[PDB]
Amino acid sequence: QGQLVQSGATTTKPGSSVKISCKTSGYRFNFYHINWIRQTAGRGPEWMGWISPYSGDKNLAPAFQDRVNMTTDTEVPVTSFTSTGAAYMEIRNLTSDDTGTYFCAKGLLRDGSSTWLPYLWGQGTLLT
Amino acid sequence: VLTQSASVSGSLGQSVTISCTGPNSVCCSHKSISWYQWPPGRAPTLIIYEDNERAPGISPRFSGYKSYWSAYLTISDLRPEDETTYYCCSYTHNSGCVFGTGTKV
Amino acid sequence: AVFLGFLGAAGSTMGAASNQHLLKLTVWGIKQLQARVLAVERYLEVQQLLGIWGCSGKLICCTNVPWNSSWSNKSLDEIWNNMTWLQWDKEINNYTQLIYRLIEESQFQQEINEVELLAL
Amino acid sequence: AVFLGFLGAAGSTMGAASNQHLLKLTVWGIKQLQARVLAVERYLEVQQLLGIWGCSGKLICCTNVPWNSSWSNKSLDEIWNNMTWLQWDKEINNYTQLIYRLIEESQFQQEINEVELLAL
Amino acid sequence: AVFLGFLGAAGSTMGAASNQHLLKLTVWGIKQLQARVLAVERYLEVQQLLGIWGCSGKLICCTNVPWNSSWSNKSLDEIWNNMTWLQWDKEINNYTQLIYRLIEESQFQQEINEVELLAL
Numbered sequence: 001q002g003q004l005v006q007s008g009a010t011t012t013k014p015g016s017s018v019k020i021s022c023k024t025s026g027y028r029f030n031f032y033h034i035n036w037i038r039q040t041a042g043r044g045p046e047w048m049g050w051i052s053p054y055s056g057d058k059n060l061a062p063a064f065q066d067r068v069n070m071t072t073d074t075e076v077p078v079t080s081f082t083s084t085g086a087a088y089m090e091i092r093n094l095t096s097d098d099t100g101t102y103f104c105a106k107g108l109l110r111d112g113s114s115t116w117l118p119y120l121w122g123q124g125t126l127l128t
Numbered sequence: 129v130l131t132q133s134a135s136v137s138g139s140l141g142q143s144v145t146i147s148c149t150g151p152n153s154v155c156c157s158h159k160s161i162s163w164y165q166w167p168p169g170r171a172p173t174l175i176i177y178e179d180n181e182r183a184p185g186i187s188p189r190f191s192g193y194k195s196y197w198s199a200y201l202t203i204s205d206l207r208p209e210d211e212t213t214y215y216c217c218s219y220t221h222n223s224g225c226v227f228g229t230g231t232k233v
Numbered sequence: 234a235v236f237l238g239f240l241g242a243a244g245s246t247m248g249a250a251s252n253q254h255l256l257k258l259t260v261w262g263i264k265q266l267q268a269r270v271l272a273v274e275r276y277l278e279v280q281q282l283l284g285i286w287g288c289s290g291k292l293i294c295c296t297n298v299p300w301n302s303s304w305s306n307k308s309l310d311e312i313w314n315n316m317t318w319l320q321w322d323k324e325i326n327n328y329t330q331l332i333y334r335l336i337e338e339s340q341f342q343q344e345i346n347e348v349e350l351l352a353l
Numbered sequence: 354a355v356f357l358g359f360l361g362a363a364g365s366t367m368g369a370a371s372n373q374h375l376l377k378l379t380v381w382g383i384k385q386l387q388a389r390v391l392a393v394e395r396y397l398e399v400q401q402l403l404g405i406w407g408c409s410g411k412l413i414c415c416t417n418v419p420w421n422s423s424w425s426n427k428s429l430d431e432i433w434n435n436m437t438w439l440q441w442d443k444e445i446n447n448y449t450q451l452i453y454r455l456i457e458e459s460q461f462q463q464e465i466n467e468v469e470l471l472a473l
Numbered sequence: 474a475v476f477l478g479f480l481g482a483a484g485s486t487m488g489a490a491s492n493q494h495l496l497k498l499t500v501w502g503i504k505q506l507q508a509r510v511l512a513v514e515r516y517l518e519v520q521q522l523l524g525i526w527g528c529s530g531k532l533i534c535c536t537n538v539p540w541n542s543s544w545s546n547k548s549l550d551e552i553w554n555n556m557t558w559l560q561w562d563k564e565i566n567n568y569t570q571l572i573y574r575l576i577e578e579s580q581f582q583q584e585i586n587e588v589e590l591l592a593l
């Protein structure tokens with residue numbers, strides 16, 4: 001189960017630095033990576049990066065190496081295996097090329113070869 | 129940098145095969161290949177991870193394969209709802225998905 | 234007394250966790266006496282299952298009872314690389330009594346096949 | 354507590370049978386306490402013979418002591434297809450202490466032959 | 474209760490030695506009760522080390538931990554044909570806790586190599 005509701009579809013103008021939220025429910029927020037992948041209108045789907053809500057470790061794409069700031073606040077425990085965390089992501093020198101729908105997805109597993117694979121996607125926030 | 133099939137399609141009862149190949153920096157005999165059923169703009173779906181492993185809940189019709197230079201995605205026994213787009217990932221254990229050009233059906 | 238180090242990896246995945254004398258009947262003496270009896274009772278309670286399943290002296294013993302998929306439909310990547318031993322128990326706690334009886338008889342039928350094998 | 358199902362075939366042939374907390378020293382509490390101690394004592398009493406004979410975790414263990422015909426002169430059809438485990442004990446109850454000492458040393462001499470074998 | 478015959482060769486070399494019911498809380502009853510509990514406690518205290526080292530039901534079990542010469546520098550003729558088990562303990566009593574942890578993990582790593590071996 002689980003649902004990763006995203007922020008609002010707010011659109012600004014070039015030069016801005018919009019922040020996109022992604023709060024989770026129904027699963028252990030610290031047990032899986034969070035992942036952000038956009039779908040540019042004039043490009044193929046582009047993977048941006050994942051961060052570990054537990055270790056606090058980040059790994060992003062070269063096209064977003066010094067352009068994206070993504071963070072996560074700690075989880076609010078609900079039961080032994082349910083938490084309510086949140087994931088935020090910003091962009092630096094945003095232009096009209098970054099126009100498109102943005103997604104947040106959680107990791108596939110918590111060990112092995114495909115640990116961080118974006119398995120459970122959110123809802124999507126439409127940008128400029 | 130990761131090319132796929134231009135386009136393919138079939139009828140209810142047959143099967144397809146969406147290719148996914150590329151240069152030595154993205155494919156294949158040293159990276160894992162995953163497959164997503166991704167309708168454009170909407171919430172996608174993980175259908176295959178690391179070459180041929182099926183995600184939980186996936187019907188046993190989505191069979192995967194990977195030779196030393198290309199990975200295939202067979203969608204045997206087609207359904208009306210299978211007609212969307214498909215992209216393939218290129219990833220290891222400590223990296224990121226390198227998506228492909230996509231292939232509609 | 235023994236160790237709670239097993240418990241170190243209670244939140245880790247199943248693949249990571251697995252990888253003086255004189256008696257005086259004072260209020261503390263009776264308290265400390267039952268703790269001594271309650272230890273050897275709970276210890277042998279587990280240790281007799283390991284013996285009757287043909288697994289005494291073993292930490293990980295493979296059996297011969299096939300995995301009936303009705304007990305769990307999850308993948309080997311969904312179990313050993315996702316679930317923790319604490320939550321995996323809650324999912325399978327219905328069939329634990331049904332599984333403990335199969336391992337009990339798989340050992341019993343293995344014993345009679347050995348008494349026929351070593352007779353040659 | 355364990356099982357009296359073993360006892361189901363007490364009249365069957367030998368071949369068929371083989372094939373809350375808090376302590377209170379009330380009159381019932383002292384009664385129920387010794388029952389708990391008398392169980393683990395009688396249990397390990399048998400379980401240490403199985404261990405010292407090299408048969409821990411086993412239900413049927415074959416040994417290396419030959420059957421001295423002076424213990425019983427009956428045939429294998431007269432034993433496993435006729436006598437019951439209850440009456441077979443009465444016939445052999447004289448040599449049970451004489452047999453338990455041979456199985457005890459057959460295991461002991463097997464241990465020193467293994468420490469010489471695995472040294473190669 | 475068991476035997477003090479092991480103790481027969483307490484001065485021999487290491488190579489020679491190795492080769493009714495009802496409870497009543499009277500002063501004697503409480504005395505005889507703890508003796509019964511103190512026996513099963515000290516018995517399982519040793520018997521759980523043998524089990525966790527993969528040596529249950531064994532008198533002499535060979536391990537896989539090499540002999541670190543810093544524990545003792547003596548020769549095999551200086552040990553098994555000279556020292557007695559009573560005095561050999563005093564020489565090595567410092568590393569006994571350091572050795573008991575290696576035999577404990579040599580068994581643990583042997584168990585995971587078997588679960589990978591029997592999977593073929």
Ligand SMILES: *[C@@H]1O[C@H](CO)[C@@H](O[C@@H]2O[C@H](CO)[C@@H](O[C@@H]3O[C@H](CO[C@H]4O[C@H](CO)[C@@H](O)[C@H](O[C@H]5O[C@H](CO)[C@@H](O)[C@H](O)[C@@H]5O)[C@@H]4O)[C@@H](O)[C@H](O[C@H]4O[C@H](CO)[C@@H](O)[C@H](O)[C@@H]4O)[C@@H]3O)[C@H](O)[C@H]2NC(C)=O)[C@H](O)[C@H]1NC(C)=O
Nearest residue numbers: 031032033052055057059110111112113115221222244245
């Ligand atoms: C508590 O619960 C959490 C979450 O459930 C557990 O954290 C997860 O552990 C698993 C398994 O250990 C992790 O999966 C691994 O992911 C790594 C990816 O990290 C690598 O890449 C980073 C970016 O490139 C890099 O910085 C890392 O390098 C070091 O730096 C960080 C800094 O914090 C440090 O924390 C790291 O530990 C590194 O020392 C790192 O190299 C990946 O490498 C792993 O793949 C290998 O291992 C698997 C076997 O496990 C094998 O199959 C692969 O083929 C490959 O050999 C593996 O995928 C996961 O990322 C963790 N985080 C999550 C899921 O969010 C935590 O372990 C639990 N702790 C306890 C005590 O229970």
